[PDB]
């Protein structure tokens, strides 16, 4: 968890999400309400979202529950792809379900979809958040990196790499956190970092 | 015409000879240009000695007609022989040709890829240029792999006969010039069936095969079963996808494609695209489920070939092993399921295999395919039923398998230890009634008129 | 090489695009294309267009044999107009030279076979 | 279980049940023979012969009153390849096999035909009975038995019931109703299945 | 939907020349596991045979295999 140091979240495989408390050997929540592997996971950041989980699975459902609440999804989304990468926006509001050919910007405020963005050709793996939280760069199984604008959204810039690529993040240096080099790990078995100084 | 070969011989003899060695020169070409003539006659008669004769008068040819370094070779007088010799209805000519010179030689297989482009351009020979380049198949690996030419291997560092890429060129080029002019229906099923081991890597650029592939595997039926090697091939090499793999995969496996032949590929592939990991577990349990059903009336040799199968992915997907294991939880859901018997909710002859309903279904059909008539078969469902202790079954020692194969093994166990046999046969072997014994008749009997 | 067009437009590859396009089946890659890509499609060739003007000699073939084929499709698909003119003013950049440089060729010409007349007389002097 | 001379025989059944686009009448007699053969191989030992399944459901869609559309099981329908279909014959009545139909014949009448055919029809009709009647256990009867009723209704279909004799009509809404019975039987009875209830080592 | 997952079937019991049971430990230490070896002397044959001993038991190729039976097999022919 961003804010408390010692409270963790954990998809497994089989239908379940959970908290864990680091101190205690046995798990504070238990979330279920999946169908099928859920394979991604994150806390929403924010202020007001103290505690709020959301979670991607194989059954086509993004679901964000409440830690308050242990019942069922407080919102759930169901797409018509395995949905594979998930994150929430820094700013709190928005999501990105990364599910297929295609992305898709979810808001939270109303529990309604903003946008479909297609513009891979095998599945997209993994996404990133980018320069100042202003830049959201997908990695997708076509070897092909290509980063959005995060108003707008439309394809600002992107590359293509020799391998389907499996995993991919921009990270920072620093104060004011500019993204100091991009790491992208492929299916080929190496981890491409490209470095930018400044 | 021993005596006109004995001579064909001595005058290439002499002509290596002078060639070597050396208002006079223009007869001193001409005897090349008449025994070119003498030599395409002799061709079409020995004309495997007459061929070799060939090849040695070429490379004299390329070793000395000129003042240069380099040995340029008559790109005109091959393709002359390369046209007597794909004309030529002679198998073991072909034969001796496609042996000991073009899968030997890097040049000859060069030069031989251009002059065919060139040939082809300009049925039956259709037919046997598609046996030679069938022929080659072997592709040398690296520019330091090529490393045995036949005449003048080029100091240049940058020829393009040095230079892996002009060979793949050149290769693509003549299987382009082949499908451009168009190949008849056993042609494509060779070239479906011999795709992705000796034709897709002799392309610089594959994308064609991929175009033409994806029509023939949108197509359907077993051209789209042998299909599935090359796109599967060009998927991994140049990822160039598919829009729908594995719906296009799930109704692709349909009724008659385990009884057809080329089942031992189909499994191969098959079991890598169900090793991969990014798989749903609803999806795995569909393709099994429809695999089940389809066992139901598979052939023996591809139940022994299901079976293992299924165990390595009940194995690795644990998810899906609750259809071999399904307790009713609620006594109210035992209640229920006394009073009215339980309806599979599978859905057969639908779309998406992430939609079907296989999870809440159960092996129904393989518990059942246990009572097959052959125990061996019986026995590898039984290994479903018993218990899970061997960590995997490799599937090779279970492809490949036919009825040749169970005959040949019931033929290749021991002549005879002492059997059993019936006691108390009935002398009413084919009578229709016999009301005077009351033991039934025979169904064969009553259902059959012998009379 | 239909797919192969298909997949480099949607995906906004360059390489893949580059080994389809840089080489019959140009009429059968057209004839299989789709039509947004289409579109896309002259837009990338207008970059190729100003970026290096060296040969035109495949793909004003490629262009021509688009608007042949799926030019109708860009009428019933028509906001994207500035696809259009963005190569449309490019070629009006494309003809200034023939203003005068016809006028060029020909004055230089006698150059050459003035030196072809001297060069044909050389042989037999 | 095993057998040293048993199986071989079974096998070479199967083999040939399995196999063997059918060609000709004889094609279909012998494999009807056949089929009957491996029945009494597997009576009193409740066995499944998937191959006699299929060739079954495959003579009996192949017999073309009109055609097979689609949706008829998923056992491999093949094409009647010289007109080996029947006709408008109603008035020719039954009749039980002989073993000269074994023989090829080139030269047959087309009542001679019609009659061998509506022979093979009804008896293949009456080995299904029976193997129904055998297998109303093997908890994949109704996996193993629904194209048969589709395959039923589809004859009882009224542009088969145009070509089809009266008998016909009366065996299989026998068989339609038997089937219907015994389906329901086993849609009652079938179970959950539960194998690894497994009793712990010490 | 399709990632190549050719190398994550290795926690499989492995077969050898005497033992037909050596888990995944280590390359070192499945050799210790192999009767009649030491642990310097499985870190002279991993070391002759050039394989990294970061790399785990199953995690290598046939060749690779066959040619540790060789030089398990012939101490002497490869130098020592």
């Known amino acids: 968890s961003p804010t408390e140091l010692t409270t963790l979240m954990s998809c497994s495989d089989d239908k379940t999400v959970r908290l864990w408390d680091l101190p205690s050997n046995d798990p504070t929540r238990l979330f279920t309400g999946h169908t099928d592997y859920v394979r991604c996971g994150a806390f929403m950041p924010g202020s007001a979202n103290s505690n709020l989980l959301v979670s991607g699975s194989y059954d086509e459902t993004v679901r964000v529950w409440d830690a308050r609440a242990p019942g069922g999804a407080v919102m759930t989304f169901k797409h018509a792809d395995p949905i594979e990468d998930v994150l929430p926006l820094p700013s709190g509001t928005t999501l990105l379900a990364a599910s297929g050919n295609a992305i898709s910007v979810l808001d939270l405020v109303a529990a309604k979809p903003l946008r479909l963005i297609t513009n891979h050709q095998k599945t997209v793996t993994s996404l990133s958040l980018a320069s100042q939280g202003r830049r959201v760069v997908s990695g997708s199984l076509d070897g092909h990196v290509k980063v959005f604008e995060t108003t707008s959204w439309n394809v600002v810039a992107g590359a293509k790499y020799p391998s389907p690529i499996l995993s991919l993040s921009v990270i920072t240096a620093g104060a004011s956190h500019d993204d100091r080099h991009l790491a992208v790990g492929m299916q080929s078995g190496v981890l491409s970092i490209r470095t930018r100084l400044s | ?451 | 090489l239909g797919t192969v067009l298909n997949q480099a437009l949607r995906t906004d590859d360059s390489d893949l695009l580059e080994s389809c396009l840089q080489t019959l089946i140009i009429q059968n890659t057209i004839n299989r294309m789709d039509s947004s890509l289409a579109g896309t499609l002259l837009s990338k060739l207008a970059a190729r267009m100003h970026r290096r003007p060296g040969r035109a000699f495949g793909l004003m073939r490629w262009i021509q044999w688009t608007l042949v084929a799926h030019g109708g499709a860009l009428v019933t698909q028509p906001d994207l107009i500035n696809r259009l003119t963005e190569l449309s003013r490019v070629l009006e950049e494309r003809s200034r030279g023939l203003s005068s440089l016809l006028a060029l060729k020909g004055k230089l010409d006698m150059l050459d076979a003035q030196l072809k007349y001297r060069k044909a007389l050389k042989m037999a002097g | 279980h095993f057998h040293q001379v048993c199986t071989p025989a079974m096998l070479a059944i199967a083999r040939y049940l399995g196999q063997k686009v059918p060609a000709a009448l004889s094609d279909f007699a012998v494999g009807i023979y056949l089929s009957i053969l491996a029945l009494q191989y597997q009576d009193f030992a409740k066995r499944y012969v998937p191959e006699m399944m299929n060739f079954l459901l495959n003579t009996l869609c192949a017999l073309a009153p009109e055609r097979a559309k689609s949706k008829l099981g998923n056992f491999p329908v093949h094409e009647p390849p010289a007109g080996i279909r029947i006709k408008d014959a109603t008035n020719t009545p039954i009749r039980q096999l002989n073993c000269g139909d074994c023989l090829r014949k080139d030269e047959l009448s087309p009542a001679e035909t019609s009659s061998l055919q509506i022979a093979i029809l009804s008896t293949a009709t009456a080995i299904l009975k029976s193997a129904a009647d055998t297998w109303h256990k093997l908890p994949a009867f109704i996996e193993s038995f629904q194209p048969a009723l589709s395959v039923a209704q589809h004859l009882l279909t009224k542009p088969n019931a145009s070509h089809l004799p009266s008998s016909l009509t009366s065996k299989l809404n026998d068989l339609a109703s038997h089937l219907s019975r015994l389906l329901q039987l086993s849609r009652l009875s079938r179970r959950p299945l539960e194998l690894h209830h497994h009793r712990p080592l010490a | 939907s399709l990632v190549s997952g050719e190398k994550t079937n290795f926690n499989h019991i492995l077969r050898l020349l005497n033992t037909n049971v050596d888990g995944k430990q280590k390359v070192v230490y499945a050799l210790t596991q192999i009767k009649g070896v030491g642990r310097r002397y499985s870190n002279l044959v991993c070391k002759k045979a050039d394989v990294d001993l970061k790399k785990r038991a199953g995690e290598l190729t046939s060749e690779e295999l066959e040619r540790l039976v060789t030089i398990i097999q012939n101490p002497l022919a490869y130098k020592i």
């Open chain 2, 1 to 451: 015409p021993k005596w006109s070969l004995a001579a064909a011989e001595a005058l290439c003899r002499v002509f290596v000879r002078l060639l070597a060695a050396g208002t006079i020169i223009n007869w001193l070409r001409d005897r090349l240009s008449d025994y070119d003539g003498v030599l395409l006659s002799m061709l079409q008669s020995l004309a495997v000695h007459a061929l070799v004769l060939a090849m040695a008068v070429l490379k004299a040819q390329a070793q000395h007609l000129t003042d240069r370094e380099e040995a340029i070779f008559p790109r005109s007088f091959f393709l002359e022989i390369i046209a007597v010799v794909l004309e030529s209805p002679i198998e073991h000519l072909r034969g001796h040709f496609s042996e000991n010179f073009v899968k030997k030689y890097d040049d000859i297989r060069f030069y031989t890829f251009e002059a065919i482009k060139h040939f082809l351009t300009e049925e039956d020979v259709r037919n046997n240029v598609f046996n030679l380049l069938l022929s080659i198949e072997d592709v040398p690996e690296s520019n330091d792999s090529l490393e045995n030419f036949f005449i003048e291997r080029p100091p240049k560092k940058k020829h393009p006969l040095l230079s892996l890429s002009q060979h793949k060129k050149q290769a693509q080029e003549a299987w382009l010039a082949f499908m451009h002019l168009g190949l008849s229906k056993e042609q494509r099923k060779k070239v479906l069936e011999v795709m992705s081991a000796s034709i897709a890597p002799w392309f610089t650029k594959p994308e064609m095969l991929m175009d033409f592939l994806t029509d023939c595997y949108n197509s359907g039926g077993s051209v789209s079963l042998l299909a599935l090697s090359g796109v599967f091939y060009l998927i991994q090499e140049r990822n160039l996808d598919y829009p729908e793999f594995y719906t296009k995969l799930y109704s692709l496996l349909d009724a008659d494609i385990l009884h057809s032949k080329y089942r031992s590929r189909f499994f191969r592939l098959l079991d890598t695209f169900l090793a991969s990991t990014h798989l749903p577990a609803v999806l795995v349990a569909s393709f099994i489920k429809r695999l089940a059903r389809l066992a139901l009336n598979a052939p023996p040799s591809a139940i022994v070939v299901i079976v293992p199968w299924f165990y390595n992915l009940f194995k690795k997907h644990p998810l899906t092993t609750f259809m071999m294991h399904r307790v009713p939880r609620t006594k109210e859901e035992r209640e229920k399921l006394e009073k009215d018997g339980l309806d599979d909710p599978f859905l057969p002859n639908e779309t998406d295999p992430m939609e079907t309903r296989a999870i809440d279904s159960c092996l129904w059909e393989i518990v059942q395919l246990q009572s097959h008539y052959h125990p061996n078969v019986a026995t590898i469902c039984k290994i479903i039923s018993e218990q899970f202790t061997k960590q995997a079954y490799n599937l090779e020692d279970f492809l490949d398998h036919s009825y040749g194969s169970l005959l040949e093994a019931e033929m290749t166990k021991e002549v005879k230890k002492p059997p059993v046999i019936e006691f108390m046969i009935p002398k009413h072997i084919f009578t229709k009634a016999a009301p005077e014994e009351e033991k039934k008749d025979s169904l064969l009997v009553s259902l059959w008129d012998f009379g």
